[PDB]
Design a protein around this ligand. Structure first.
Ligand SMILES: CC(C)CCC[C@@H](C)[C@H]1CC[C@H]2[C@@H]3CC=C4C[C@@H](O)CC[C@]4(C)[C@H]3CC[C@]12C
Ligand SMILES: *[C@@H]1O[C@H](CO)[C@@H](O)[C@H](O)[C@H]1NC(C)=O
Ligand SMILES: *[C@@H]1O[C@H](CO)[C@@H](O)[C@H](O)[C@H]1NC(C)=O
Length: 985
């Protein structure tokens, strides 16, 4: 075993060496034929760039920023498959004046009516393109049933008789039972006007299906564009209709039918649920108007001021009407966003002591996805930010690669060093595009980072070259240089790539892509450095030999071997006691080094210095610990969208003027049997099999639990208001419900829904199959709150309230934010797992390149300590541990390992007798590269700080912390730690 270990250590070294020797020779080849390498590398890069032609973006927010658990998603599916939801467009008008003033009001009125005026031509409908693929045929049985149901629906509706006598109310079997079609046949749904949405799949291409009055019977997919242009539909055609009239929620409902008059003040009996008597249509003034100012007279309030008026337009959500709806919404959003009434408000007084203003915000279902498209493209701002960053790093590079002796200085390399990285980004991206990898919104930051990381290798190479001033034959110098820095530049990259790849495994596609693209970019960039940049180094080197400055060479063109460690050691020894030990004036890094040797190192060596260092880092870690205590997770999905987004702006306004009406949480109940049955025709709660298998809704106690639940949820502070029809029904006619007869229950509830005014309002929240309430629902408003954590807290509580365990009844609380927030729960662990894998993998790699084992252990300690610091301080800075932040933390390992490793490897390879000696040598030889690498990266990413997109700024903040601690520890703590307890001999 000992012999085996010996042989192994022999292999590692031997191999590590061989690799170096190989690069040593490769350099020679490039040195002799620099042009060939540059031209070929560039052309090859271009080809990859061509790949961009196939660049396909990804715009499904859910895939981009959600686990896609297939659970909450499944919930949406179930909800949509059986319950008819309704597309709702929200239009809010905000101002600093009393929009209630008659003159303004009248204008606002036309604004509203304008919506109805909006008209969409058929040609606009993209879905029903003049040439498309007909949707897959709906299962035959499904078709049959749809035919049957639609037929009986009419029949029943005509009859109007609600009779449950025939319905068998026997408890269903485990199979839900108590010839597929026959089974699905003979099913009476109530309300009769309901047919399971899933079964509703008729080709919407035939206009006859969607809009009947048209009487056209014209297939849009088979119609001329001009012909389609001819036909035009309006909101009324695709709007939910109350009492045969679009069910808007505008204030103007009050004035309808002369119930009230714009010119006169608004006086209503109840601000909560006033009803226009003439129209018999109800309205919630509190919901419609914001910042209301009302008086009280004869029990009738006198609304006399409001600086916000919101109108909700309800549009059908049926599959058939889906394509058409989207079209109208698009027209609507444009219309509202550009509508302006500044003229009327010009002289009207303000309450904000600011210029009279009026703004029309609008939010439709298509809004979110549309905004995703906007975030998909590369904002000009981002572009600009990149440019600034590139300039910064360009300046920094040059400012460090230029000197008094121009021919000695190597500006060319620096310049191309930057490009090298960029070209890498393009080439890599193109390669991935070729592979089909879709781009993501977070990819905007990829260029920024890639460039920064790449330029770092440039510094390293140059450092080796410069420190090899002794060498006379340039070819040899370049060769030796590359040989010296080969392992370093290779490992550094390898580590980075590895980390990103490991991260790519993330479920969230955004992270996956961002990482994948970055990793590929880094890879190709490295290749470019070994080719392009190296070739440029060769050219400049050759010029230096001739002492020909770049410009000089241009006009003109138009017309031994010693370990650097050995040398540096000898230098110090010699110092302790010539040309070899005197860097030529203008060596690329001559100054900085001198500064480090004559100032920084002395300080570090100083006991007082050390004292300071240790204490400083001490407190740093301490602060980090407290930071961890203040750890908060989660970020609102909307944050993704730029703040400027009208969506974001809309939400803000709503919150400001309508705080109570925040999240419209919706709770649903879905009999497992019913769901399963119909789900079948179209070939967590599931925890317990009998969770919702069979519920006797006639059980008075159960009924009582229901009303109690309503009361409980109402009590909850976060809940602002609830609308549970069942409660209304139970309270309305509990006496009749006293007798617990299943059939009786069905009939009573059915009639209640059919007749009672309130009941009619809740007609679409209850569905009965064969006399049994297979599914139902109720909704409640949850006050708006920013913290994702507290939000989830509230929702989770709601779930508890909605779980009649005694009667085996568990209802599902649903909200859009649910899926996104759901991810927050597991973010804490997944990160640990990923980080762990990364750390390990990276450590293993370093171990194979770090000579001493003890040095490896030192590195690990440093890495972990940094990570604690970067995490602790992110929490301390308030950076929530969101997806964006976490990935950066996990990825941080790569950056940190690089800087730490360089110093460590040097200290080990030092020939210094005393530990301190080694430290000084290591620092004098690698401190420059380390500093340059980190700083360069930060400079490029600095501009991201001014990015509108929230996720971007988080990226900047987190990475800035990473880089900071990395460089800090690598340049300060690590040195002193090694100087005190470092591997010796
Ligand atoms: C005795 C009665 C008249 C008092 C007032 C009852 C009101 C507050 C009840 C009865 C009908 C209920 C409405 C029924 C339908 C809907 C549409 C749904 O998408 C949101 C909730 C909402 C808007 C309900 C809100 C609360 C509601 C308006
Ligand atoms: C329901 O139908 C059955 C069978 O036709 C009949 O006997 C009973 O009287 C009906 N009850 C009603 C009309 O509610
Ligand atoms: C019923 O369920 C599905 C859909 O028709 C099918 O796979 C199965 O064979 C059917 N069986 C019968 C009895 O029709």
């Amino acid at each position: 075993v000992k012999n085996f270990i010996h042989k192994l250590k022999e292999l590692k070294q031997k191999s590590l060496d061989k690799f170096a020797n190989l690069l040593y020779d490769y350099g020679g080849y490039v040195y002799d034929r620099p042009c060939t390498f540059i031209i070929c590398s560039l052309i090859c890069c271009l080809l990859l760039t061509c790949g961009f032609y196939f660049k396909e973006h990804e715009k499904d927010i859910y895939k981009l920023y959600s686990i896609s658990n297939s659970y909450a998603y499944e919930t949406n599916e179930t909800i949509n498959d059986f319950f008819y939801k309704s597309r709702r467009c929200f239009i809010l008008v905000e101002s600093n004046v009393n929009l209630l003033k008659p003159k303004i009001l009248r204008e606002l009125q036309k604004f509203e009516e304008g919506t109805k005026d909006i008209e969409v031509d058929l040609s606009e409908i993209n879905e029903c393109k003049t040439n498309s693929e007909l949707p897959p045929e709906q299962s035959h049985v499904a078709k049959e049933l749809y035919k049957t149901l639609i037929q009986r629906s009419e029949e029943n509706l005509k009859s109007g008789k609600i009779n449950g006598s025939l319905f068998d109310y026997s408890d269903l079997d485990e199979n839900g039972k108590s010839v597929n079609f026959t089974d699905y046949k003979d099913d009476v749904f109530y309300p009769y006007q309901y047919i399971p949405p899933m079964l509703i799949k008729a080709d919407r291409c035939k206009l006859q299906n969607v809009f009947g009055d048209k009487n056209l019977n014209i297939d849009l997919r088979e119609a001329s564009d001009g012909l389609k242009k001819q036909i035009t539909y309006t909101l009324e055609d695709i709007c939910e209709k109350k009492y045969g009239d679009c069910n808007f929620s505008s204030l103007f409902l009050y004035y309808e039918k002369g119930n009230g008059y714009i010119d006169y003040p608004i006086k209503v009996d109840n601000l909560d649920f006033y009803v226009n008597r003439r129209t018999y249509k109800e309205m919630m003034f509190k919901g419609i108007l914001g910042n209301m100012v009302y008086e009280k007279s004869g029990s009738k309030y006198i609304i006399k001021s409001a600086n916000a008026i919101m109108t909700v337009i309800p549009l059908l959500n049926s599959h058939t009407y889906e394509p058409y709806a989207l079209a109208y919404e698009k027209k609507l959003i444009d219309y509202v966003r550009f509508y302006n009434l500044d003229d009327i408000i010009q002289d009207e007084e303000t309450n904000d002591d600011n210029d009279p203003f009026i703004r029309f915000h609008v939010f439709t279902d298509r809004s979110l996805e549309d905004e995703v498209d906007r975030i998909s493209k590369i904002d000009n701002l981002t572009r600009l930010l990149l440019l600034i960053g590139v300039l910064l790093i360009f300046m920094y590079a040059l400012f460090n690669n230029v000197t008094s002796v121009l021919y000695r200085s190597k500006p060319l390399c620096a310049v191309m060093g930057i490009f090298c990285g960029f070209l890498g980004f393009l080439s890599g991206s193109g390669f991935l595009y070729f592979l089909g990898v879709k781009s993501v919104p977070p990819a905007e930051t990829v260029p920024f980072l890639v460039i920064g990381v790449g330029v770092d290798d440039v510094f390293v190479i140059l450092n080796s070259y410069s420190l090899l001033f002794m060498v006379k034959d340039n070819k040899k110098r370049i060769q030796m240089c590359l040989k010296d820095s080969a392992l370093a530049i290779t490992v550094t990259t390898l580590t980075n790539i590895i980390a990103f790849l490991i991260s790519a495994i993330s479920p969230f596609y955004s992270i996956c892509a961002f990482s994948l693209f970055t990793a590929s970019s880094l890879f190709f960039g490295y290749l470019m450095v070994l080719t392009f940049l190296l070739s440029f180094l060769c050219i400049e080197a050759k010029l230096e030999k001739k002492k020909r400055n770049i410009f000089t060479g241009t006009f003109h063109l138009f017309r031994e071997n010693i370990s650097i460690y050995e040398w540096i050691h000898n230098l110090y020894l010699f110092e302790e006691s010539k040309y070899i030990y005197e860097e030529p004036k203008g060596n690329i890094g001559k100054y900085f080094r001198s500064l480090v040797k004559n100032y920084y190192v002395p300080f570090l060596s100083s006991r007082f210095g050390k004292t300071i260092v240790y204490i400083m880092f001490t407190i740093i870690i301490a602060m980090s610990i407290y930071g961890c205590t203040l750890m908060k997770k989660g970020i609102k999905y909307d944050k993704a969208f730029p703040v400027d987004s009208y969506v974001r702006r809309f939400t803000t306004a709503k919150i400001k003027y309508f705080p109570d009406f925040g999240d419209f949480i919706e709770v649903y109940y879905f009999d497992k049997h019913f769901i399963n049955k119909y789900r079948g025709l179209e070939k967590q709660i599931m925890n317990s099999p009998k969770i919702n298998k069979n519920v006797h809704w006639e059980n008075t106690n159960l009924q009582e639990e229901l009303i109690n639940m309503h009361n409980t949820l109402e009590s909850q502070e976060f809940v602002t208001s609830v609308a549970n029809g069942f409660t209304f029904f139970l309270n309305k006619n509990k006496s009749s419900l006293r007798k617990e007869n299943p059939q009786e229950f069905y009939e009573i509830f059915a009639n209640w829904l059919k007749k009672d005014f309130v009941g009619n309002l809740f007609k679409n929240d209850f569905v009965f199959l064969n006399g049994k309430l297979v599914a139902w629902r109720f909704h409640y408003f949850q006050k708006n709150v920013d913290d994702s954590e507290i939000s989830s807290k509230w929702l989770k509580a709601c779930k508890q309230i909605t779980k009649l365990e005694n009667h085996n009844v568990q209802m599902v609380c649903f909200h859009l934010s649910s899926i996104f927030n759901e991810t927050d729960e597991s973010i804490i662990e997944v990160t640990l797992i990923n980080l762990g894998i990364t750390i390990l993998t990276i450590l293993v790699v370093t171990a194979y390149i770090i000579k001493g084992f003890y040095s490896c252990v030192i590195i690990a300690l440093i890495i972990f300590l940094i990570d604690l610091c970067i995490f602790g301080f992110m929490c301390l800075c308030g950076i929530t541990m969101n997806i964006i932040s976490m990935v950066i933390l996990v990825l941080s390992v790569g950056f940190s390992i690089d800087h730490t490793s360089h110093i460590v490897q040097a200290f080990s390879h030092s020939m210094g007798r005393t530990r301190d000696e080694k430290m000084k040598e290591s620092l004098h030889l690698m401190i420059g590269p380390v500093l340059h690498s980190g700083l360069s990266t930060w400079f490029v990413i600095s501009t991201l700080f001014f990015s509108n997109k929230d996720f971007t700024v988080i990226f900047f903040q987190t990475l800035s912390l990473v880089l900071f601690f990395s460089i800090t520890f690598s340049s300060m703590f690590l040195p002193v730690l090694l100087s005190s307890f470092g591997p010796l001999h």
